[PDB]
Structure 1
Amino acid sequence: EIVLTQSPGILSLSPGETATLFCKASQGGNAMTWYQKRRGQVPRLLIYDTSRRASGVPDRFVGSGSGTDFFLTINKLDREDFAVYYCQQFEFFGLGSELEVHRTVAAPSVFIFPPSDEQLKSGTASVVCLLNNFYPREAKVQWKVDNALQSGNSQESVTEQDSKDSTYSLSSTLTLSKADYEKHKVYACEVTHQGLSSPVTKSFNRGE
Structure 2
Amino acid sequence: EIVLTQSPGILSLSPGETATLFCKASQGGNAMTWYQKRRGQVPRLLIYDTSRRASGVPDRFVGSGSGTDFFLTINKLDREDFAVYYCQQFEFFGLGSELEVHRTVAAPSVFIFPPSDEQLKSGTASVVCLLNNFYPREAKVQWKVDNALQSGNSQESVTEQDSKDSTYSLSSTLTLSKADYEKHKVYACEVTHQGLSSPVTKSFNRGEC
Superimposed CA distance per residue, residues 71-101 of structure 1 (whole angstroms, 9 cap, x where no aligned partner): 0000001000000000000111000000000
Aligned match of 1:144: 144
Q: CA deviation at 1:153?
A: 0.4
Superimposed CA distance per residue, residues 48-84 of structure 1 (whole angstroms, 9 cap, x where no aligned partner): 0000000000000000011000000000010000000
Q: CA deviation at 1:206?
A: 0.3
CA distance in 2, matches of 1:143, 1:202: 10
Q: CA deviation at 1:199?
A: 0.5
Aligned match of 1:48: 48
Normalising by structure 2, what TM-score? 0.99
Structure 1 spans left out of the alignment, 5+ residues: none
Percentage identity across aligned positions?
A: 100
Structure 1 runs, 4 residues or longer, greater than 6 Å off: none
CA distance in 1, matches of 2:171, 2:76: 34
- SS in structure 2 of the partner of residue 207 of structure 1: coil
Q: CA deviation at 1:16?
A: 0.4
How big is the alpha-carbon RMSD for the aligned residues of Structure 1 and Structure 2?
Answer: 0.4
Q: CA deviation at 1:7?
A: 0.2
- SS in structure 1 of the partner of residue 63 of structure 2: strand
Q: CA deviation at 1:151?
A: 0.6
CA distance in 2, matches of 1:84, 1:182: 45
CA distance in 1, matches of 2:196, 2:97: 28
CA distance in 1, matches of 2:76, 2:117: 53
CA distance in 2, matches of 1:184, 1:62: 59
Aligned match of 1:196: 196
Superimposed CA distance per residue, residues 93-129 of structure 1 (whole angstroms, 9 cap, x where no aligned partner): 0000000000000000000000001110000000000
Aligned residues: 208
CA distance in 2, matches of 1:77, 1:196: 31
CA distance in 2, matches of 1:174, 1:65: 48
Structure 2 spans left out of the alignment, 5+ residues: none
Q: CA deviation at 1:28?
A: 0.4
Superimposed CA distance per residue, residues 144-188 of structure 1 (whole angstroms, 9 cap, x where no aligned partner): 000000010000000000011000000000000000000000000
Aligned match of 1:66: 66
- SS in structure 1 of the partner of residue 88 of structure 2: strand
Normalising by structure 1, what TM-score? 1.00
- SS in structure 1 of the partner of residue 118 of structure 2: helix
